[PDB]
Amino acid sequence: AMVPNVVVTGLTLVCSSAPGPLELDLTGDLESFKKQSFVLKEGVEYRIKISFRVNREIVSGMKYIQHTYRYGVYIDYTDYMVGSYGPRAEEYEFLTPVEEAPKGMLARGSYSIKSRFTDDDKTDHLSWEWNLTIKKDW
Question: Where's it found, cell-wise?
């Protein structure tokens, strides 16, 4: 111990009509993501996929949280129940239900997302910030 129990490894934006992969390596330098962004075409359906491993013991009440900002203004809170996961060699993948990108010129542009992977004990398994850009086109 300081053998971590949970290691959050990746964020993926799942979108069938995206021209390429939208992935964050969460084992890297988390700061660099603030000077990067993922593009989504306005109005499209997507899901967020969180890749994580459990090394030692059963974690209950896992939870994925997203705080969404536009120019530093707080505009949405979304949390998803992830559930209970036991230790395993193979990484787990949590997928959100379907979300939809907003639509219209006024809703276009870059949004800031503060992500948190936590649980019933409020453990900070991993906290990170990334950007989502909504455009007219890919």
Answer: Cytoplasm
- Give the resolution in Å: 2.4
Which are the contacts of 42, defined by CB distance < 8 A and separation ≥ 6? 101, 102, 103, 104, 107, 108, 134, 135, 136
Q: Which CATH class is domain 1-138?
A: mainly beta
DSSP 48-95: EEEEEEE-SS-EEEEEEEEEEEETTEEEEEEEEEEEEE---SSPEEEE
Q: Which two tokens stand for residue 80?
A: 């998803």
Residue 67 pairs with which residues in a beta bridge? 77, 114
Task: Give the single-character DSSP code of 24.
Answer: E
What was the structure determination method? X-ray
